[PDB]
Assembly symmetry: C3
Homo-oligomer: 331 residues x 3
C-alpha cells in the first residue's frame, strides 16, 4: 500500500503582491496535476508537471483539506489502525497553517467553527462528534513534542520550563517503536477540554522560540492522538480497538533529522538494504510510518511565486518520489 502524497499551494501574501510577484504554479485538481513554469524570461514554454494523489490550488480552504484528506484517514484510525500525516515544504508555505491552523481575529468564531483552524483541532473535534454517545466507550489522549537540534521538548508538560528535555529509547515491546521518556500524555475527557490544552501548548512553543535560534523553522512538531475503543457484541464479547494518529509538521525543507529523513526516504525508494532510521530522532519516531504498518500520507506545501522556483521544484520532486514507498497498514 503506497504512501499517498498530496500537494497544497498557498495563495499569494501581501509582500508578494507588493513585489508584483508572478505565479509559476498551475494546479489542476481534476487531473490531479501540478505544473510549474520553469524558464522565466528566457523560455516561456518549459514546464515540469507532476501527478499526485490529490492537488489543492490556492483557493483550497481548511475545510476542503479536512474533508478530502483527513476524514478518510480518521475513519481508518477509528477502525483501530495507525495513521500518520506529515507536512513537508519550504518555510513560509503553509505547513503549520495546514497542520494546526490559526485563530481568526476578534472572537468572531468558536474554535470548532473557525475557518482558519487546521488539521489538529478539526481532528480532535471530530473524534468527539463521531464517537460520543454512538455506543462506544472510548478515551482520547494527546501528546505534543518538538524536536530541535535533536533535543526533545514537551509542549503539554505541566513543567513550567519548556526547555526541560525528554529522552528517547527503543520500545522493547514494539519493534519499530520508541518510548519518549517523560512525555506528558493528556487524557482529553470531552471536546470542551480541547482548546485550553492546545492553547497552553502553543504558549510554551512561543516561549521556546524566544529561547532558541530560528526555532519554529528548524523544529519538527509531533502531535499524537490515541483512541481506545471498547465495544460489546450481541454475542456478549468485549472487544478493544486502539487507533493512533500522528500529525507531523516538519522543519522547513529549504538539520540531522531533516537530512536523515531524506536519506531514509531515498533508501526506501531505491530499495537499498539498510534504512538508516536510527540516525535521527525524527526517523526513529517515524520508523513505523516509513516502511512499517502505519498508513502514511504526505502533504507537500508550496508557494506560487516565481521567487521560490527552486525550492518549489525541490519540494515537488522530493514529494513525488515518496509516492513509491510501500507501507503495510495493519491493526
Amino acid at each position: 500500500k503506497n504512501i499517498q502524497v498530496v500537494v497544497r499551494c498557498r495563495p499569494f501574501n501581501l509582500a508578494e503582491r507588493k513585489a508584483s510577484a508572478h505565479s509559476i504554479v498551475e494546479c489542476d485538481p481534476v487531473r490531479k496535476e501540478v505544473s510549474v513554469r520553469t524558464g522565466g524570461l528566457a523560455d516561456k514554454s518549459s514546464r515540469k508537471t507532476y501527478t499526485f494523489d490529490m492537488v489543492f490550488g490556492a483557493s483550497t480552504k481548511q475545510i476542503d483539506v479536512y474533508r478530502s484528506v483527513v476524514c478518510p484517514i480518521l475513519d481508518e484510525v477509528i477502525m483501530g489502525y495507525n495513521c500518520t500525516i506529515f507536512a513537508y515544504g519550504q518555510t513560509g508555505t503553509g505547513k503549520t497553517f495546514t497542520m494546526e491552523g490559526e485563530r481568526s481575529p476578534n472572537e468572531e468564531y468558536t474554535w470548532e467553527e473557525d475557518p482558519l483552524a487546521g488539521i489538529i483541532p478539526r481532528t480532535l473535534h471530530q473524534i468527539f462528534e463521531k464517537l460520543t454517545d454512538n455506543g462506544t466507550e472510548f478515551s482520547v489522549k494527546v501528546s505534543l513534542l518538538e524536536i530541535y537540534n535533536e533535543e526533545l521538548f514537551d509542549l503539554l508538560n505541566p513543567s513550567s520550563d519548556v526547555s526541560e528535555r525528554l529522552q528517547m529509547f527503543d520500545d522493547p515491546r514494539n519493534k519499530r517503536g520508541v518510548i519518549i521518556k517523560g512525555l506528558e500524555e493528556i487524557t482529553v475527557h470531552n471536546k470542551d477540554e480541547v482548546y485550553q490544552i492546545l492553547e497552553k501548548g502553543a504558549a510554551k512553543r512561543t516561549t521556546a522560540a524566544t529561547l532558541m535560534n530560528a526555532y519554529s523553522s528548524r523544529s519538527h512538531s509531533v502531535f499524537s492522538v490515541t483512541i481506545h475503543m471498547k465495544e460489546t457484541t450481541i454475542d456478549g464479547e468485549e472487544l478493544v480497538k486502539i487507533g493512533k494518529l500522528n500529525l507531523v509538521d516538519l522543519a522547513g525543507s529549504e538539520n540531522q533529522s531533516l537530512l536523515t529523513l531524506g536519506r531514509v526516504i531515498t533508501a526506501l525508494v531505491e530499495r537499498t538494504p539498510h534504512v538508516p532510521y536510527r540516525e535521527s530522532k525524527l526517523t526513529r519516531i517515524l520508523q513505523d510510518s516509513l516502511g512499517g504498518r502505519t498508513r502514511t500520507s504526505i502533504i507537500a506545501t508550496i508557494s506560487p511565486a516565481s521567487l521560490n522556483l527552486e525550492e518549489t521544484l525541490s519540494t515537488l520532486e522530493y514529494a513525488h518520489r515518496a509516492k513509491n514507498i510501500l507501507n503495510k497498514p495493519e491493526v
Copy 2:
C-alpha cells in the same frame, strides 16, 4: 596594451569620523602612487606602496573620475571598439557610487548636472551630446542585468516581477561571447528617455533587495550600452560594459579571481566557463575588448587588511594584456 588599473579612495563617512578613525591611506596623483600605513602602533615606518595608471584621492569628485577615466574610453567606443570598466572592492568603498552614483535630494539638480551622478548617467548623456553634434546616423541601446547566486535578473525588463530569470548560452558567431536569453535591450532614442529607464531599473533592484539576502552586496551588476553608427565608407558597433562587482570581502567572484590569476601566471586553461560573470566577461579579458578596473578603497585604519587585499588584487591585474 595592458588592462588599465586605477584606484579611488573615498572620504571618511560619519560613523568613521565618530569612531575617531585614523587614515592609513595616502594617494599621490602625480607619482600615481597609493601608500598604505601598515604598522599600526607597533611600527610607524612600515608602508606598502603601489603604482597604478591613475590614483584618485578622497577629494576626487564624480566629474573628475568621468573626465579622467571614461572620456577617453568613450572615444574608443565611438570609434567602434569594445570597452569594459569594472569596479572592484570591499562593500562600502564606493563601487556603486562610482559606477552609478546617487541623486542629490529635493530635485536640486537635473540628472545631467547632479554632482553625485556617476559613470553610467554621465556616459549616456555624453553619448547623445557627442553624436547628435556629429551628424552621422546612430542608434543607442541599453541593458542592465544582475548576477546573484549565479541567477540572472533583468532590471529593465517590462516583466513586473524582478525574479523572472534570464538564461545564458554560448554565442555561435563569437568564440568568447554569450547570448543572454530573455534580455531586454531598450533603444534610447533621445537623452530625454534616459532617466526614466534608469529610474525603473533602480526601482526593480530595490524590490530585489527586499527578496533576497544581502542582495546588493552579493550581486554583480552588468550595465551595457551599444552604439550602432551608420558610416560610409558601413556599420561601426561600439559596446561599453560598465560593471559593478560584488563586494570583494560567491561562484562568480571566486571564479573571477581564478581567471585573473590564470591570466597573470599565463596558464593554459583560464576557467571562464565556471561562473556566469566570467562567461559574460570572457570576451573582455584576454579578448579584443579594452578593459579598465577601478579599485575602490576606504581610508580607515579599521579596514587595513581588506584595503591591502584590494590593492594587491587590482595591482597584479595590470600585467594582463588586453589584445584588442
Copy 3:
C-alpha cells in the same frame, strides 16, 4: 598548581520571564556543584563536581575578591607573576567578575561600589597595602584585547582604537614577549585609577561598534606591574617586581587563543613536556606568569538555567580537566 573555583550567577529577567528552572545547586561548604541532568526523563540524575571553591548566585563581588584575589595579591607583592582567568559561556558573568559594573547615579564611589569587580578592587587595595606599608613603590597598568588574533590597545593615546599592536620575543626573557606599541600608564595614586579605567572602557565601547561580536570573542588582558624599591645599609637598591594579569577570556560557547590556552592548561596539568605557549597570542602573552611557580586561578562562571544545560556541563568539565578534584562520598 592551579586553583579552580566556580561562580554561578543569579537568574536574569529573561530567564524569569520564560519560567526557567534551575539545574544548578552550589554548596560552598562542600565545595560542590551539583547539576540536574535528566530534565523530564529522569528526575533523579545528578552530576557532581568538586572544586577549590564554590560561589552561589548570592555571592557578593567583595567576597569573590577577598577569597580569591587577596592571597594572590600577597604573592604579587612578594615579587611574583600571577594570572587570574574568568572562563565560561557568554552571558554567565566573566566581565562582571573581572571588571564589574558601575552602580547607576553616584550612590557610591568606585572604591565603594558593590558592583565593582576584581580589577578596580585590586588597584584600590594595592595602594592601601603599600601606601601605609613603608616602602617606595611604583604602579603601572596596561589593558589590551585580543580579537581574531589581532591586538588592540585600550589605554593608548591614539584616538583610533583600531590601531594594532604587534608581538615579539623578549630577547632578555625567553619566556616573555614585547608588546610593541603598548601603552603602560603610571598610576601615581588611587585618584588616577578611575579615569584610566573609564577611558579604556570607552575605547572598548567604540571597538564593539566596529567589529562583529567583539566583546564575546575578545580576550581582555589587564596587567598591573608593581615596582618596589628598598635600599641596603650601604645605599644599594634592590627592586622586586610583581605582576598581576586579570584575564577576561572569550566566551567558551561552541577562538585560537582560547583553544591554545586549553591545551596549555591541559599540558601544564597532566604535566606533558612541551607546553604550547607559542601557538597563540594569549598564551605567548601569559607564558611569563604561568607554569606553577606562581599562583594561577580560574574562575569558571556558569548559569543556573535549564536552557544552558550543555554549555554549563561543558564549562564544568573544562574546569574539572584543569584540576581534577575527586568527590567526597
